Design a binder for this molecule. Structure first.
Ligand SMILES: *[C@@H]1O[C@H](CO[C@@H]2O[C@@H](C)[C@@H](O)[C@@H](O)[C@@H]2O)[C@@H](O[C@@H]2O[C@H](CO)[C@@H](O[C@@H]3O[C@H](CO[C@H]4O[C@H](CO)[C@@H](O)[C@H](O)[C@@H]4O)[C@@H](O)[C@H](O[C@H]4O[C@H](CO)[C@@H](O)[C@H](O)[C@@H]4O)[C@@H]3O)[C@H](O)[C@H]2NC(C)=O)[C@H](O)[C@H]1NC(C)=O
Ligand SMILES: *[C@@H]1O[C@H](CO)[C@@H](O[C@@H]2O[C@H](CO)[C@@H](O)[C@H](O)[C@H]2NC(C)=O)[C@H](O)[C@H]1NC(C)=O
Ligand SMILES: *[C@@H]1O[C@H](CO)[C@@H](O[C@@H]2O[C@H](CO)[C@@H](O)[C@H](O)[C@H]2NC(C)=O)[C@H](O)[C@H]1NC(C)=O
Ligand code: NAG
Ligand code: OTY
Ligand code: ZN
Ligand code: ZN
Ligand code: ZN
Ligand code: ZN
Length: 447
C-alpha cells in the first residue's frame, strides 16, 4: 500500500514517506519535488473524530487513524501537482507544468467499437500480469512488519490489477483476535456507511491512473456496465468482453476468454484469520461466476430495473443516521443496495449495487474477493455514475455526510483506507467533470 521507496526499515523508523522526485544532488535532495517547487514533505492530517461504537473494540487495528500506524509525514503537493512524490498531475490536468486541462469520458462498455472493446480486455489482462511500478503490499500486520529478525520488511511486489484487489481486501478484512481474545466486532472501511461511494470512487480513479500509466495512453478511461436492465442474463458475459460461461464447468469462464486464465488473490480467509497474516501476491484458483445461478434466493436472479436507478436519485439526503446498512431515506444506503430504491430500509431488500454483485453467484459476490472478477470494475463505474449524477442534481450537499460517529473508516475527513498518499472522503465528494477530469456518457431514466 506504500511506495516501494518507503517499505524499508529506515523509512518506517523515520515515520516519513517522502520519496525523491529527481535526486540529482544525491539521495534525499529532491523529496516531493521540493527542489522544483512541486511539493513538500509535511505532517499527515488524519481524522481524530470519534466513530460509532463497537463491542468489543481494542483499538489496536492498524487501520485506525490511517496512515498513522506507519507514517506521519507524506508529500503535500503544490498547485495541480500530485503523486506520492508530486511527480504527476492532479486528475483533470496534464503537462510538466500540470496546466493543460484534460477531460476523459467513461462510456457504456456495450457502446464501444469492436476495436476499443479488444483494447479494454487486453489492457485489463495486461494490468493483471504487470508489476505495479510503485506500490508494494504488506503481507504481515504492523507488529510483525519487519520480520522475524526485525530487519526484513514483509512487503511483496504485486501486479497492477492485483493491487486493485488487495486494497479492497484490506479495507474489509476482520480485525485480528489472536489467542484467548474474544470475537471482536466486525468492521468495514469501505461499505455499510457513507464512505462506500467515495472509497470506491477513488478506487476506480487509482486503477484508471495506473492503467493510463501502464499503457502510456493518458486518455484511457474505464467503461461501465449498465446493470439496471431487469435482465436475467449478464449482457457483457461474452467471449469478446468479460467472458461467457464455460461449456465444461458452468461456474467457470469460457476458455475462449483471457479471464478464464486469471487466478485470484486473497482467498485464504482461514489462513489469515488464524495465522495472523495478510493477503499476499500469490494467486490460487480461478474466477467463479454463475449469473442468475443463485437458485436458493430467487430475489438474487434478476438485475435491478431501470426505474430503480431513477427512483433512488429521488432520495435527497446523502446519508442518514446511524450511517449504516440499516439507514432509511439515505441515498447512500439505497444505491449501495441495503434499502429499497425508494429509500425504505428492509433487512430483506437487496437492490442496485448489492443486487448486481449477488446476481453473479460467484467470486464477484464474496466481499473479500469480489474485485478479482473484472466485472467489478464496470459494476462500480456504473455505481459511480449514479453517485456523480446525484452530486450534480443536489449541488454536492455534503452536509448529511457525518463528521463523527459514523462507522470506523466513514467519518467525512477519514483518510480512505489503505490509499496512498492519504486522501479523505471529502476530496472525492465533488462533481467529476469539473473537479476530477472525467465524465460519464450516460442517459438517465426519465419517469
Ligand atoms: C512521527 O514519527 C516519528 C517516527 O516514529 C516512527 O514512525 C511512527 C509513524 C510510528 O510508527 C512510530 O512508532 C515509529 O517509531 C516519531 O519519532 C519517534 O517517536 C518515538 C516515540 O516517542 C521515539 O521513541 C521513543 O524514544 C524515547 C527517547 O529516546 C531515547 O533514546 C535512547 C534509546 O533507548 C534511550 O537510551 C534514551 O533514554 C533516550 O531518551 C524512549 O524513551 C521511548 O521508549 C519508551 O517508549 C516506548 C514506546 O514509545 C516503549 O516501547 C519503551 O519501552 C519506553 O517506555 C521511545 O522509544 C523515537 O525515538 C522517535 N524517532 C525518531 C527518529 O525521532 C515522531 O515523534 C512522530 N511525530 C509525531 C508528531 O507524532
Ligand atoms: C451460488 O448460489 C448457490 C445456489 O443458489 C449457493 O449454494 C447454496 O447455498 C445455500 C445457502 O447457503 C445452501 O444451503 C445450499 O446447500 C447451496 N446449494 C448448492 C446447490 O450448493 C452458493 O453459495 C452461491 N455461491 C456464491 C458464491 O454466491
Ligand atoms: C442499525 O444497527 C445498529 C448497529 O447494530 C443498531 O444499533 C444497536 O442499537 C441497540 C438498541 O438501540 C443497542 O443496544 C446496540 O448496542 C446497538 N449496536 C451497536 C453496534 O451500537 C441499530 O438498532 C440499528 N438501527 C436501526 C435504525 O434499526
Ligand atoms: C520490484 O520491481 C522493480 C522494478 O519493477 C525491481 O527493480 C525490484 O528488484 C523488484 N523488487 C523485488 C523485491 O523483487
Ligand atoms: N454483501 C452484500 C453485497 C456485496 C457488497 C460488496 C461486495 O464487494 C460484495 C457483495 O456481495 C449483501 O449480501 O447484501
Ligand atoms: Zn477505535
Ligand atoms: Zn504543502
Ligand atoms: Zn466494494
Ligand atoms: Zn461493490
Amino acid at each position: 500500500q506504500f511506495p516501494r521507496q518507503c517499505a524499508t526499515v529506515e523509512a518506517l523508523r523515520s515515520g516519513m514517506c517522502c520519496p525523491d522526485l529527481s535526486p540529482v544532488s544525491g539521495p534525499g535532495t529532491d523529496r516531493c519535488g521540493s527542489s522544483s517547487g512541486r511539493g513538500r514533505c509535511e505532517a499527515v492530517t488524519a481524522d481524530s473524530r470519534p466513530h460509532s461504537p463497537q463491542y468489543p473494540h481494542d483499538g489496536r487495528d492498524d487501520r485506525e487513524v490511517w496512515p498513522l500506524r506507519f507514517f506521519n509525514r507524506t508529500c503535500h503537493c503544490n498547485g495541480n501537482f500530485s503523486g506520492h512524490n508530486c511527480g504527476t498531475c492532479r486528475p483533470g490536468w496534464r503537462g510538466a507544468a500540470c496546466d493543460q486541462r484534460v477531460l476523459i469520458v467513461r462510456r457504456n462498455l456495450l457502446d464501444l467499437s469492436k476495436e476499443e472493446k479488444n483494447h479494454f480486455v487486453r489492457a485489463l489482462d495486461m494490468a493483471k500480469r504487470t508489476t505495479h511500478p510503485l506500490f508494494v503490499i504488506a503481507t504481515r500486520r504492523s507488529e510483525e512488519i519487519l520480520g522475524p529478525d526485525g530487519n526484513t520488511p514483509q512487503f511483496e511486489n504485486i501486479s497492477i490489477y492485483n493491487y486493485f484487489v488487495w486494497t479492497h481486501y484490506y479495507s474489509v478484512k476482520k480485525t485480528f483476535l489472536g489467542v484467548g481474545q474474544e470475537s471482536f466486532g466486525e468492521v468495514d472501511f469501505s461499505h455499510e456507511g457513507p464512505a462506500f461511494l467515495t472509497w470506491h470512487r477513488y478506487h476506480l480513479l487509482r486503477l484508471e491512473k495506473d492503467m493510463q500509466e501502464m499503457l502510456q495512453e493518458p486518455s484511457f478511461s474505464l467503461p461501465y456496465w449498465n446493470f439496471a436492465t431487469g435482465k436475467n442474463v449478464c449482457d457483457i458475459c461474452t467471449d469478446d468482453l468479460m467472458g461467457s460461461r464455460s461449456n465444461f464447468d458452468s461456474t467457470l469462464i469460457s476458455p475462449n476468454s483471457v479471464f478464464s486464465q486469471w487466478r485470484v488473490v486473497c482467498d485464504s480467509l482461514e489462513d489469515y484469520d488464524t495465522l495472523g497474516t495478510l493477503c499476499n501476491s500469490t494467486e490460487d484458483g480461478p474466477i467463479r461466476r454463475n449469473p442468475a445461478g443463485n437458485v436458493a434466493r430467487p430475489m438474487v436472479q434478476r438485475l435491478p430495473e431501470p426505474q430503480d436507478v431513477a427512483q433512488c436519485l429521488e432520495v435527497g439526503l446523502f446519508d442518514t443516521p446511524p450511517f449504516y446498512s440499516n439507514s432509511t431515506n439515505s441515498f447512500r444506503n439505497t444505491v449501495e443496495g441495503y434499502s429499497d430504491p425508494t429509500g425504505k430500509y428492509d433487512p430483506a431488500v437487496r437492490s442496485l449495487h448489492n443486487l448486481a454483485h449477488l446476481f453473479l453467484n460467484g467470486t464477484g459476490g464474496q466481499t473479500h474477493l469480489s474485485p478479482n472478477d473484472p466485472i467489478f470494475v464496470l459494476l462500480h463505474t456504473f455505481t459511480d455514475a449514479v453517485f456523480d449524477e446525484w452530486l450534480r442534481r443536489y449541488n454536492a450537499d455534503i452536509s448529511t455526510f457525518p463528521l463523527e460517529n459514523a462507522p470506523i473508516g466513514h467519518n467525512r475527513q477519514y483518510n480512505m483506507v489503505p490509499f496512498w498518499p492519504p486522501v479523505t472522503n471529502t476530496e472525492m465528494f465533488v462533481t467529476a467533470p469539473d473537479n476530477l477530469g472525467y465524465t460519464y456518457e450516460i442517459q438517465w431514466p426519465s419517469r
